[PDB]
Design an enzyme around this catalytic site. Structure first.
Site, PDB file in Angstrom:
ATOM      1  N   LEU A  24       0.856  -1.217   0.000  1.00 27.53           N
ATOM      2  CA  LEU A  24       0.000   0.000   0.000  1.00 27.53           C
ATOM      3  C   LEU A  24       0.881   1.253   0.000  1.00 27.53           C
ATOM      4  O   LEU A  24       0.535   2.194  -0.728  1.00 27.53           O
ATOM      5  CB  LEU A  24      -0.933  -0.020   1.211  1.00 27.53           C
ATOM      6  CG  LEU A  24      -2.019  -1.093   1.179  1.00 27.53           C
ATOM      7  CD1 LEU A  24      -2.873  -0.974   2.421  1.00 27.53           C
ATOM      8  CD2 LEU A  24      -2.878  -0.994  -0.078  1.00 27.53           C
ATOM      9  N   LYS A  47       1.843  -2.616   9.082  1.00 26.09           N
ATOM     10  CA  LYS A  47       3.195  -2.010   9.164  1.00 26.09           C
ATOM     11  C   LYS A  47       4.107  -2.995   9.895  1.00 26.09           C
ATOM     12  O   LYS A  47       3.781  -3.376  11.017  1.00 26.09           O
ATOM     13  CB  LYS A  47       3.130  -0.644   9.856  1.00 26.09           C
ATOM     14  CG  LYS A  47       4.409   0.158   9.714  1.00 26.09           C
ATOM     15  CD  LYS A  47       4.319   1.643  10.031  1.00 26.09           C
ATOM     16  CE  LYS A  47       5.609   2.330   9.647  1.00 26.09           C
ATOM     17  NZ  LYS A  47       5.787   3.673  10.233  1.00 26.09           N
ATOM     18  N   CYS A  94      -7.543   0.121   6.912  1.00 22.36           N
ATOM     19  CA  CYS A  94      -7.063   0.416   5.542  1.00 22.36           C
ATOM     20  C   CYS A  94      -7.691   1.731   5.081  1.00 22.36           C
ATOM     21  O   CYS A  94      -8.939   1.840   5.116  1.00 22.36           O
ATOM     22  CB  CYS A  94      -7.455  -0.651   4.541  1.00 22.36           C
ATOM     23  SG  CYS A  94      -6.556  -0.568   2.990  1.00 22.36           S
ATOM     24  N   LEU A  95      -6.855   2.713   4.694  1.00 22.13           N
ATOM     25  CA  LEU A  95      -7.330   3.982   4.133  1.00 22.13           C
ATOM     26  C   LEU A  95      -7.119   3.934   2.615  1.00 22.13           C
ATOM     27  O   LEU A  95      -5.969   4.120   2.174  1.00 22.13           O
ATOM     28  CB  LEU A  95      -6.569   5.132   4.786  1.00 22.13           C
ATOM     29  CG  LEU A  95      -6.574   5.179   6.311  1.00 22.13           C
ATOM     30  CD1 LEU A  95      -5.817   6.350   6.865  1.00 22.13           C
ATOM     31  CD2 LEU A  95      -7.962   5.175   6.893  1.00 22.13           C
ATOM     32  N   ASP A 140       6.195  14.847  11.678  1.00 16.74           N
ATOM     33  CA  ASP A 140       6.298  14.460  10.248  1.00 16.74           C
ATOM     34  C   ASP A 140       4.956  14.688   9.564  1.00 16.74           C
ATOM     35  O   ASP A 140       4.598  13.876   8.717  1.00 16.74           O
ATOM     36  CB  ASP A 140       6.727  12.998  10.088  1.00 16.74           C
ATOM     37  CG  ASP A 140       7.373  12.679   8.748  1.00 16.74           C
ATOM     38  OD1 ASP A 140       7.881  13.629   8.101  1.00 16.74           O
ATOM     39  OD2 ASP A 140       7.364  11.471   8.374  1.00 16.74           O
TER      40      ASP A 140
END
Length: 288
Positions: A24, A47, A94-95, A140
């Site tokens: 992704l 991740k 999930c985006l 960030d």
């Protein structure tokens, strides 16, 4: 008021989820891969991080922030062995809505409005406010890190990569400026939202220019016509306070959220903006 602490699952992720090679995106600490719950077949994001103390910090800070609706939720965290090496595997919602600026690019004849920008900035602001209130700084905040839940129009924008996040830690005075970094980021995002180009850019547009670095240090930005012709002086002043070179002079998130432009999005005019058009033209330059 009280919420559950992080329960790191030691069971193999394969038991609960089906892992795919499809990537992704790349997070700074680790690659992000799409995965599906074996039972529900629902899409999720994984991740993968090596079990260094920095990784443990990321997962803890993300878990604290996961509650915020405008921060990506961590459904579960797994401590597992990959190739006999300890790994922390973070399962997040999930985006698939895509990056903030990508969505604006994909809106067609429909024009981006000042009001739409205010709503977007308020969403990002709420995330930063929650983080700052719980003494976390993302450090960030970037367009890439802001992503939409779904392609549906009522999708929610969420902040994502906590790799750089750090803890900031009778009546008394409040006395790092790690928090100020996030406010500068908001200013940059806001500028791009209103015009479709970054406040600071490189001659020859190659990564980071020495000249661009000088402009950032000197705070040399202009609001150029025609893009900024119809933009309110109020909005420009807000950007100036966010893009103050000196971190101490920079606006606090509480000040930003209380600013009328952010506070009353409904009151904000629907003045059409050049952002959608500029983004499409810039993409054309990238894709010759």
């Amino acid at each position: 008021h009280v919420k559950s602490g992080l329960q790191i699952k030691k069971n193999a992720i394969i038991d609960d989820y089906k892992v795919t090679s499809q990537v992704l995106g790349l997070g700074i600490n680790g690659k992000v891969l799409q995965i599906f719950n074996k039972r529900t077949q629902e899409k999720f994001a994984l991740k993968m991080l090596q079990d260094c103390p920095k990784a443990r910090r990321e997962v803890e800070l993300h878990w604290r922030a996961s509650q915020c609706p405008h921060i990506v939720r961590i459904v579960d965290v797994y401590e597992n062995l990959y190739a006999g090496r300890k790994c922390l595997l973070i399962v997040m919602e999930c985006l698939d809505g895509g990056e903030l600026f990508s969505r604006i690019q994909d809106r067609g004849d429909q024009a981006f409005t000042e009001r739409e920008a205010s709503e977007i900035m308020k969403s990002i602001g709420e995330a930063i406010q929650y983080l700052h209130s719980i003494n976390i700084a993302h450090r960030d905040v970037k367009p890439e890190n802001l992503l939409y839940t779904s392609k549906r129009p009522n999708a929610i924008l969420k902040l994502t990569d906590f790799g750089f996040a750090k803890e900031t830690t009778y009546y008394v005075a409040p006395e790092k400026y790690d928090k100020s970094c996030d406010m500068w980021s908001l200013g940059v995002i806001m500028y791009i939202l209103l015009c479709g180009y970054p406040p600071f850019y490189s001659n020859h547009g190659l990564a980071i220019s020495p000249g661009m670095k000088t402009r950032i240090r000197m705070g040399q930005y202009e609001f150029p016509n025609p893009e900024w012709s119809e933009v309110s002086e109020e909005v420009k002043m807000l950007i100036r306070n966010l893009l103050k070179t000196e971190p101490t002079q920079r606006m606090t998130i509480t000040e930003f959220m209380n600013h009328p432009w952010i506070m009353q999005s409904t009151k904000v005019p629907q003045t059409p903006l050049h952002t959608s058009r500029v983004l499409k033209e810039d993409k054309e330059r990238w894709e010759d």
